[PDB]
Amino acid sequence: HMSVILDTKGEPVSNAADAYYLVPVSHGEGGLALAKVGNEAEPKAVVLDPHHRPGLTVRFETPLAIAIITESFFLNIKFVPSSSDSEVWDVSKQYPIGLAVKVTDTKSFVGPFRVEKEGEGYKIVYYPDRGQTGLDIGLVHRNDKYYLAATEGEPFVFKIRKAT
Structure with missing residues (x-):
């Protein structure tokens, strides 16, 4: 897996430039969006929302x-634009979703994600330890949204569309 x-x-998808949509091929409906999860007052969880179209765009980054x-x-994966320069995606325990994809201002020099070919498109895979196997990102359908979250089961599969 080195393509x-x-x-x-x-x-080719750009490093640290341009903006992309992640267009579902598997399951899941809607544009990327931020949503509230649990008892958090401000939306920080990364979701597909059937009622945000086109929804948000992302940029991939490595040094x-x-x-x-x-x-x-x-x-690292981040929205473009993002509200702060340091804002990136990360994974953490978040009830009731599980290991939810959320935005954070704490950014590691090298991020934890890989984009890997899967089926008709690509999936994201999250590596809490880079010397070990990763956990795919799939979707948890709740509140008429699809929360991105690490899973042991079916991954979220998407194609990568360059934006305007």
């Missing part, structure tokens, strides 16, 4: 001196 990652026009990403690189 260049391609968008839906067949072009490696290269202009594109591959399935072998460990990445």
